[PDB]
């Protein structure tokens, strides 16, 4: 099940604990992740609207999962694992947005608007999960912006 909190501070605080010597080091990783997530999301979107290779979508979800999990971004890493198993034909259902945003412990977060072949069913689930990744990505940027007191 998707974690209730957006940030796993237990994992991220030990990364922020290294900001004493290297000032704004953890902020640099967050900025570096935002560029990586936007690029990874674009590569996922390029395959859904273009050439379809579920092995690549399997690898794209695995790539972003390893970074988002190491930074404590649980929900992003959770959806990436869902895209990871959908490309491997291991899962056959991805819940809707209203069901996933109801799992947040603090419910004051969502006060904004959310924007044939043998593989057709899974590609729709991957396209539906990639869009869910965009919401979890935006929620993480808002949560990390408040902590660092900077825009993203």
């Amino acid at each position: 099940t998707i974690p209730s909190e957006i940030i796993n501070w237990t994992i991220l605080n030990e990364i922020i604990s290294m900001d004493d010597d290297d000032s704004d080091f953890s902020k640099g990783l967050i900025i570096q992740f935002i560029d990586q997530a936007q690029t990874t999301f674009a590569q996922m979107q390029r395959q859904l609207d273009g050439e379809k290779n579920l092995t690549e979508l399997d690898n794209l979800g695995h790539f972003l999962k390893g970074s988002s999990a190491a930074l404590g971004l649980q929900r992003i890493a959770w959806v990436c694992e869902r895209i990871q198993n959908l490309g491997r034909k291991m899962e056959h259902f991805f819940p809707n947005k209203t069901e996933l945003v109801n799992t947040l412990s603090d419910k004051s977060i969502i006060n904004g608007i959310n924007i044939k072949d043998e593989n057709s069913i899974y590609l729709i689930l991957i396209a539906k999960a990639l869009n869910q990744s965009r919401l979890e990505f935006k929620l993480a940027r808002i949560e990390l912006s408040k902590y660092y007191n900077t825009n993203l």
Partner: protein
């Protein structure tokens, strides 16, 4: 605490994961190198000097399993396992996906000494460096004690 003066190699397919583990080694003045995949890890290990390798099992070009087996096979050919000082075998800590016994045996049967689950815990990463590194820097240092 005191860290042993050993050379470390961390092998991960994500530069963000490499910067996290590298920040811990840099903070404690530990010399290290970075590898993108398994084929680079084997080539970097051939350059010599390594003591401890933190390698992910799943890698793009060459998997960490095959890289570990390729390193262990090369160590046996060169007599690794006074005319010439006995060069100790390199310590390989695998980066596994989960904490299941199947993920553990796959690393042990491939020639890895230990294992760490992903995402790598920096406190657990520290303990692995002292448990294995201090046994290579000090004589009769029992990390099991």
């Amino acid at each position: 605490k005191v860290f042993p003066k050993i050379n470390v190699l961390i092998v991960e397919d994500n530069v963000i994961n490499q910067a996290i583990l590298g920040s811990f080694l840099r903070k404690h003045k530990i010399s290290y190198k970075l590898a993108k995949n398994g084929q680079e890890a084997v080539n970097i290990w051939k350059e010599g000097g390594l003591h401890l390798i933190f390698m992910d099992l799943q890698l793009p070009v060459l998997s960490g399993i095959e890289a570990a087996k390729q390193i262990r096979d090369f160590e046996k050919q060169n007599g690794i396992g006074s005319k010439r000082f006995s060069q100790a075998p390199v310590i390989i800590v695998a980066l596994t996906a989960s904490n299941s016994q199947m993920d553990k045996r796959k690393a042990l049967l491939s020639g890895c000494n230990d294992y760490l689950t992903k995402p790598v815990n920096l406190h657990a990463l520290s303990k692995k460096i002292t448990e294995w590194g201090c046994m290579q820097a000090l004589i009769d240092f029992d990390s099991w004690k």
